[PDB]
Amino acid sequence: GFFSPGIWMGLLTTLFMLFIFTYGLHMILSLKTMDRFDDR
Amino acid sequence: VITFPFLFAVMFGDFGHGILMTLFAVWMVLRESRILSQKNENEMFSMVFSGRYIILLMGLFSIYTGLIYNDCFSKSLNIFGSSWSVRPMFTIGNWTEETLLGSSVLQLNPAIPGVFGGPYPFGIDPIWNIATNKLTFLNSFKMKMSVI
Amino acid sequence: PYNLAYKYNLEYSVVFNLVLWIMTGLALAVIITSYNIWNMDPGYDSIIYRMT
Amino acid sequence: NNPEYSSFFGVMGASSAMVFSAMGAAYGTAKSGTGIAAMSVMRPELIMKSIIPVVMAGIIAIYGLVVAVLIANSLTDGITLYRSFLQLGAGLSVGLSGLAAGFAIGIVGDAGVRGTAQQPRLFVGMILILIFAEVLGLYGLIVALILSTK
Amino acid sequence: NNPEYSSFFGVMGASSAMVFSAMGAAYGTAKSGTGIAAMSVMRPELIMKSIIPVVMAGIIAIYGLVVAVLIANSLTDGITLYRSFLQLGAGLSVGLSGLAAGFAIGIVGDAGVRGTAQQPRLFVGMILILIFAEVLGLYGLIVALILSTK
Amino acid sequence: NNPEYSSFFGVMGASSAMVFSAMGAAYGTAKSGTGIAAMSVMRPELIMKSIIPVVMAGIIAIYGLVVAVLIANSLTDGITLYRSFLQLGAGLSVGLSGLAAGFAIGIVGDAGVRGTAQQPRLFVGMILILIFAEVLGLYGLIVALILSTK
Amino acid sequence: NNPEYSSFFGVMGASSAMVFSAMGAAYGTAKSGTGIAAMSVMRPELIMKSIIPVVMAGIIAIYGLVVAVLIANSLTDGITLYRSFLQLGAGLSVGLSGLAAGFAIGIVGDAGVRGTAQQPRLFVGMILILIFAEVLGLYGLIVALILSTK
Amino acid sequence: NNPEYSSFFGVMGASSAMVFSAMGAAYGTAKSGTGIAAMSVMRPELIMKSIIPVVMAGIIAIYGLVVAVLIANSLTDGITLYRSFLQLGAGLSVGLSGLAAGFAIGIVGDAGVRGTAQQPRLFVGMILILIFAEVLGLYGLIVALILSTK
Amino acid sequence: NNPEYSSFFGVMGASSAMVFSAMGAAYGTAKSGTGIAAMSVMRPELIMKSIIPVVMAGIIAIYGLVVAVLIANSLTDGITLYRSFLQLGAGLSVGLSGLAAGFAIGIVGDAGVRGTAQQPRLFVGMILILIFAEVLGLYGLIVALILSTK
Amino acid sequence: NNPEYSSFFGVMGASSAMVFSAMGAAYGTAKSGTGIAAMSVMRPELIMKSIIPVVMAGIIAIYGLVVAVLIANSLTDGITLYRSFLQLGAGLSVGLSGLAAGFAIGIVGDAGVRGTAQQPRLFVGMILILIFAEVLGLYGLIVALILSTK
Amino acid sequence: RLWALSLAHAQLSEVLWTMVIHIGLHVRSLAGGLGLFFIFAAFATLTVAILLIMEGLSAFLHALRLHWVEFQNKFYTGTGFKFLPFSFEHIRE
Amino acid sequence: LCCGPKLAACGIVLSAWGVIMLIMLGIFFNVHSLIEDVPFTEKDFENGPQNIYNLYEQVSYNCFIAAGLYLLLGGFSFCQVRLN
Amino acid sequence: YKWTAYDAHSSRNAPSLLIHFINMFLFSYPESGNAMLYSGQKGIQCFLIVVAMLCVPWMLLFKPLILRHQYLRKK
Amino acid sequence: AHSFALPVIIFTTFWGLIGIAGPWFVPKGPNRGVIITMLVATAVCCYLFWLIAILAQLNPLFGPQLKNETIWYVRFLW
DSSP: OOOOHHHHHHHHHHHHHHHHHHHHHHHHHSOOOOSSOOOO | OOHHHHHHHHHTOOHHHHHHHHHHHHHHHHTHHHHHSSOOOOHHHHHHHHTHHHHHHHHHHHHHHHHHHTOSSSOOOOOSOOOSOOHHHHHHTTOSSHHHHGGGOOOBOOSOSSSOOOOOSSSSOGGGGGOTTHHHHHHHHHHHHHHO | OTTOOOOOOTTHHHHHHHHHHHHHHHHHHHHHHHHHHHTOOOOSOTTHHHHO | OOOTTHHHHHHHHHHHHHHHHHHHHHHHHHHHHHHHHHHHTTOGGGTTGGGHHHHHHHHHHHHHHHHHHHHHTTOOSSOOSHHHHHHHHHHHHHHHHHHHHHHHHHHHHHHHHHHHHHOGGGHHHHHHHHHHHHHHHHHHHHHHHHHTTO | OOOTTTHHHHHHHHHHHHHHHHHHHHHHHHHHHHHHHHHHTTOGGGTTTTTHHHHHHHHHHHHHHHHHHHHHTTOOSSOOSHHHHHHHHHHHHHHHHHHHHHHHHHHHHHHHHHHHHHOGGGHHHHHHHHHHHHHHHHHHHHHHHHHHTO | OOOTTHHHHHHHHHHHHHHHHHHHHHHHHHHHHHHHHHHHHHOGGGTTTTTHHHHHHHHHHHHHHHHHHHHHTTOOSSOOSHHHHHHHHHHHHHHHHHHHHHHHHHHHHHHHHHHHHHOTTHHHHHHHHHHHHHHHHHHHHHHHHHHHTO | OOOTTTHHHHHHHHHHHHHHHHHHHHHHHHHHHHHHHHHTTTOGGGTTGGGHHHHHHHHHHHHHHHHHHHHHTTOOSSOOSHHHHHHHHHHHHHHHHHHHHHHHHHHHHHHHHHHHHHOTTHHHHHHHHHHHHHHHHHHHHHHHHHHHTO | OOOTTHHHHHHHHHHHHHHHHHHHHHHHHHHHHHHHHHHHHHOGGGTTGGGHHHHHHHHHHHHHHHHHHHHHHHOOSSOOSHHHHHHHHHHHHHHHHHHHHHHHHHHHHHHHHHHHHHOGGGHHHHHHHHHHHHHHHHHHHHHHHHHHTO | OOOTTTHHHHHHHHHHHHHHHHHHHHHHHHHHHHHHHHHHHHOSGGGTGGGHHHHHHHHHHHHHHHHHHHHHHHOOSSOOSHHHHHHHHHHHHHHHHHHHHHHHHHHHHHHHHHHHHHOTTHHHHHHHHHHHHHHHHHHHHHHHHHHHHO | OOOTHHHHHHHHHHHHHHHHHHHHHHHHHHHHHHHHHHHTTTOGGGSGGGOHHHHHHHHHHHHHHHHHHHHHHHOOSSOOSHHHHHHHHHHHHHHHHHHHHHHHHHHHHHHHHHHHHHOTTHHHHHHHHHHHHHHHHHHHHHHHHHHHTO | OHHHHHHHHHHHHHHHHHTTGGGGOOSSHHHHHHHHHHHHHHHHHHIIIIIIIIIHHHHHHHHHHHIIIIIGGGTOOSOOOOOOOOOOOTTOO | OOOOHHHHHHHHHHHHHHHHHHHHHHHHHHHOOOOSOOSOOOSSOOSOTHHHHHHHHHHHHHHHHHHHHHHHHHHHHHHHHHHO | OHHHHOOGGGOTTOOOHHHHHHHHHHTOOOSSSSOOSSTTHHHHHHHHHHHHHHHHHIIIIIHHHHHHHHHHHHO | OOOSHHHHHHHHHHHHHHHHTGGGSOOSSTTHHHHHHHHHHHHHHHHHHHHHHHHTTSSOSOOOBOOHHHHHHHHTTO
C-alpha cells in the first residue's frame, strides 16, 4: 500500500501545524521597517 | 604569440574550418594595403583586421590540431595506414556469420585478440570516426589531454 | 506466467512517503530560490535611469 | 502493546509549544522595537517606559517554554498514544494561542508607543489593552497545562 | 527489533538545527548590515557599535551548531526510533526558534541602528531589546537540550 | 540485505550540496555585482576592493563542492542506508546553510559597497559583516562533515 | 535480475542536464542582450567588448551537452539501478548548477555592460565577476564527472 | 513480452518535442513582432532586416518537428520500453531546450530591434547574440538525437 | 484483450485537439479585435485588411478540427491501446501547438495593426510574421497526422 | 459486464456541455453589456444594433444546451463505457470550446461596441470578427455531434 | 574548457553534417546532383554561421580567458602605465 | 543584373569553396568505392560487394554535377563584380 | 603511466585514476575494491599530500615572520 | 601494422631539430628574440599534443562498436 495508519496520521497532524507555521511566518515576512525617522 | 593560438586550435581543432580560418587571414593580409589605406567605419571588420595576424596563426594551428584530431568537417583522413584491426582475423576469432545477428546489433571489436593493435602514425586512427562509441574512446582522451 | 504479482515493494509506503515529500520539499526550495534570484532587484538606479 | 509512532505525536507538541511561541514573541518584539526606534528619536525620555511591550512579548515565549519542557519531561518510549495526542494538543493549544497573542502585543505595542509620545494620557490605555493580549497567551497556557494530565 | 529507516528523523534534526539557525542568523545579519551601511555613511564613529546586532545573529547560528553537533554525535545505526523523534524535536525546536529570533534581531537591528544615529540615547534601548531576541533564541536551545538527551 | 532505492538518498545529497550552495553563491555574486557597478562608475579607484564579497561568495560554493565530492566518493551499491541518510542530511546541511550564507553575503555586499562609495571608512565594517556570513557558511560545512563521516 | 525501468532515472539525468543548462544559458543571454541593446546606443564602439557575457554564458549549454552525452554513452537496458541514480544525480547537479550560474552571469552582465559604457575602467571588474559566476557552472561539471563515473 | 503502457512514454516524447518547441518559437515570434511594429514607426527601412529574429524562432520549432517525427516513426507497439524512455528524454530535451532558446530569441530580438531603431549600428550585434540562442536550441537537438537512437 | 478503458486516452485526444485549438483561435481573435477597434477610429481604410490575423486564427482552429474528427472517426471500442495513445498524442500535439500559434497570431496581430495605422508599409511585414505563426500551427498538424495514422 | 462508474463519466458530459457553455455565454454577455452601457451615453441610437454580441453569446449557450440534451437523452443504465467516454468527450469538447468562444465574443464585443461608437465603419468589421468566434464555438459542436453518435 | 568546447564543436559539426548535407545525397542521379547544389549551399551557410563565426568566437574567448586567468596570474602581477610618447602617429586620421 | 557587388562577392567565395569541396568529395567516393559510409544502400542487401562500389560511383557523379552548378554560379557572380 | 602500464589484459578491475586521485587527497586506502597502479603507491600518495600541506606554512606565514624579525632586529 | 617506437623517432627528430637546432639558424635582426621564442614554443606545444594523441592509443582496453553494414563493407574493403 501507498500509506500506513501511522504515516497518514502523521501527515494529517503535520499539515495542521504546518499551516500554523505558514500563518505565523507569513505575517513575519510581511513586516517592514521605516524608510526615515520623524525628526531631530 | 604561440600559446594562445595553440590553445585556440585545441578548442577549434577542425581541419576544414582551419582552412577557412587560414584563408580569411591570408585574404586580409593580401589586401592589407587596400584595407588599411581606406576608411572602415564598421568596427567589427576593423577589429578582425587588426587581429589578422593573430587569426592567421589560429588557422595554421587549427589545421595542425584538426589533423591530429583527424576531423575535417566530421570526416576522418585515412592515409591507408589504418591498421587498427584486421577484419579477416576478426572472423577467425570465433566470429562466424555474425552479420546475421548483426542486422539488429553492433558487437564491439575486442582488444588483445592477438591480431589487433599498433598505433596510428599521426592522430586518432580514422576507424573511430565511424564507431558508435566514438563518444567514449575519444571523449576520455580529450578529458585527460585537457588536464595534462 | 500464471498471472503472478511482481512483488510490489514490501514497505512501499515508507520509501514512497519519504521520497515523495523529500523531493517535493527540495524541488520547491529550488523553485522559490530560483524565483528570488530570477527577480533580483539591481536597484534600477545610478546608471539605469540614463541607459533607459 | 504500544502503537508504534506513538512517541512521534507527543514530541511535536513540545516542539510546537516552543517554536510557535517564539515566533509570536519574535514578531511582537520586532514590531515593538520598530515603534520604539521611531518614537525614541524625538522623545528619548520615554525609552524606558516604551520597553514594556517587549517584555510582555517575552512572557509569551515563556508560556511556550513552560509547556515545551513539561511535555519533554513527560516523554517516554512506551507511550500509549492516548498520552501522546494529549501532549500534542497541549503543545498546539499554547503554541497557536501564544502565537496569536504575540501578534496582538506587537501590533498594539507599536501603535501604543507612537501614540503615547504624542499623547501621554494614552499610556495607561496602552498597558490595559496589552494586558488583555498577555491574558490571552495565559489562557493558552492554562488549558495546555490542564490537558497534560488528562 | 528496532524499526528500519529509524535514523532518518534524527538526521533531519541535525541538519534542520544548523540550516534554520543559519537562516535566522543570515537574515538578522543581512538586515543589520543594510542598516549599518545606510547609517554609518553619515556617522562612521558608530560603525564599531552598530555591529553588535550582527554578533547576536551569530550567536543564533552557534545555538544551531551546538545542537546539530550534539544530535549528530548521538546517532547510530540501530536507533530505537523513539530516540530519533526526540532528536528531530530538539533539532527543529532550536532551529525554528532561532529562525524567529533571527527576524527579531534583523528588524530591531535595522530600526535601532539607524535610529541610534538620529538619537544616540537609543543605543542602550536597542541593545536591551536585541537581548530579548537572543533570549528567544536561547529558549529554543534549552528545550532542544532537554529533548536531545531525554 | 541492502534495501534498493537506498542510494537515492545519498545521491540526492551529493547533488544538493552543490546545487543549493551554488544558488547561494550565485545570488551573492549577482547581488554584489550590481552594487559594484554602481560604485565603480561613481569612483573606479575602489574597484579592486569591492570585489571581496564576490570572492567570499565563491568560497561558499566551494564548501558545497567539498561535501558533494566527499559524498560522491562515499557512494556504493551495497549501501547500508544509514550512511545514505547521513549523506543526504550532510549534503543538505551544507547546501542550505551555504544558501543562507549566499543571501547574507549578497545583501550586505551591495549595501556596503554602495555605502563605501560615499564613505571610505565603511570598508572595515563591511569586511567584518562579510566575515560573519562566511562563518555562517562554515558552520554548515562543519556539521555536514560530522554527519557524512558518522 | 536488475530492476525494471532502471534506466528511467538515468534517462531523465541526460535530459535534465541539457534542459536546465539551456534554461541557464538562455537567461544569461537574454539579460546580457538587453543590457547590450540599451548600452550600445550611447557607445556603439563597445558593442564588441560587451558580447563577453553572452559568449561566456554559452559554456553552460556546452556543459549540459558534455554531461548529457557522457550519461547517454552509459545508458543500457541492464542497469543495476545504482548507476542509474548516479547518472540522475550527475545530470541534475550540472543542470541546476548551470542554472544557478546562468542567473549569476545574466545579472552581472547587464550591470557590467551598462556600467562599462559609463566607466570603461569597469572592464576588469566585470571580467572578474563573470569568471566567478562561470566557476559555479564549472563546479557543477566537476561533481557530475566524479559522480557519473563512480 | 514487455509491460502494457510501455508505449506511453514514447508517445509523450513525440508530443513534447513539437509542443514545447512551438511554444518557444511562438514566444520568440510574438516578442519580435511587438518590437518590430513599434520600430516601423521610426525606421520602416528596417522592416525587412528585422525579420531575422522571427526566423530564428521558426528554426526552434523545426528542431522540435524533426525529433517529434523521428520518435513517431521509431515508436512501435511492441516497444522495448527502454527505447520508449529514451524517446521521452529526447523529446523533452529538444522541446524544453528549444523553449528556453525561444525566450532568449524573443527578449534579445525585441531589445535589439528597439535599440537598433535608436542606433542602426547595433544590428550586427543583435544578429550575433541571436546566433548563440539558436545554437543553444540546436544543443537540444544534438542530445535528443543521441538519446532517441540509443 | 485490451483494457475496457483504453479508449479513454483517444477521446481525450479528439477533445483536446478541438479545445486547445479553439482556445488559441479565440485568444488570437480577441487580441486582434481589440487592436482593430482602436485602429478603426484612427482610420477607416485599413478596417477591411486588418481582418486577416483573425482569419489566420480561424485556420488554427480548423487544424484542430481536422485532427479531432480524424481521431473520432478512428476511435472504436475494441481499440488497440497503442493506437489510442497515439490519438492522445496527436490530439495534444496539434491542440497545444495551435494554442501556442494562437498567442503568436494574437500578439503580433495586435501590435501589427496598431503599428500599421501609423506606418502603412508595416502591413506586408505584419503578414509575413503572422505567416510564420500559421506555419508553426501547421507543424503541430503534421505531427498529429503522422501519429494518427501510425 | 457493464462498469457502474460509466454513467458518471456520461452524465458529467451532459453537465459539462451546459455548464461551460453558460460560463462562456455569461462572460460574453457580461462584457458586452458593460461596453453597451458605456456606449449608450454618447450614441443611444446604437443601443438596439449593439445587442448582437449578446445574442451570439446566447448561441454559444445553445450549442451546449443541445449537446447536453442529446447526451441526457442517450444516458441509460447499461452503458458500455465506450459510449460514456464519447459522451464525456463530446460534453467537454462543446462546452470548453464554447467557453473559449465566449471570451472572444466578450472581448471583441466590448472593444467593438466602444469603437463603433466613434467609428460607425467598424460595425461590419465587429460583426465579421464575432462571426469567426461563433464559428469557433460551432466547431466544438461539430466534434461533439460526431462523438456522441460514435 | 579545452575539452568542453572541443567536444561541443565536434558535436555541432556532426549534427550539421548529418542533418543537412546527408540529405543532399540520393539514389536518384539528376535529383541528387541538383539537390546537392542547393543543400550544400545551405550546409556552407550554416557551417560558417554556427562554427566558423560563433564557436570560433567561443574558442577564441575561452582560450584567451585561460591565458588571462590561469596563466598570467601565476607571474604577471601588478600594474603599470601605458607608454604614450609624443609622436606623429595620427597621419591617416 | 547587378544585385549588389557585396552579394556577388559572397557568391564567388561560396562558389569557389563549393567547387573545391564537391570535387574532392566526389573523388573520395570514387576512390573508396569509405569513411562517410552513407551511400543509401538497399535494405535487401545481398552477397554482392560490387553493389556497394556501384552505389558510390553514382554518388560521385552527383558530386561533380553539383560542382558544375557552382562553376556556373561563380562565372555569373564573377562578371557581376567586374561590371559593378 | 596508466596508458603505458595497463593493457586490455587487465581491463577488469583496471584502476580508475579519478578515484585514486580523490582517495589520495583524503588518505583513503581501502583494503579492497580498488587495485593500485603500482606497488608502494600508498606510501607515495601519503608522502606527497603531507608535503603539499607542509608547503602551506612556508607560503602562509614564514615571510611575514622573518620580516618581523628583520624589522625588530633593525629597530 | 605499426610500432610505436618509429613514430616517436620520426616526429621527435622533426620537432626536436626545430626547437633545438632552429634557434641556431636565426637572423640577427630585431626580431631574433621573438623568432627563437616562437620556434621553441611551437615545437614544444605541437610535439606534446601529438605525443599525447599517440600514447593515448597504446594498450587499448576496447575496440570500436561498428554497425553491421559497416563491418561488412570493411571486410571487403581492407
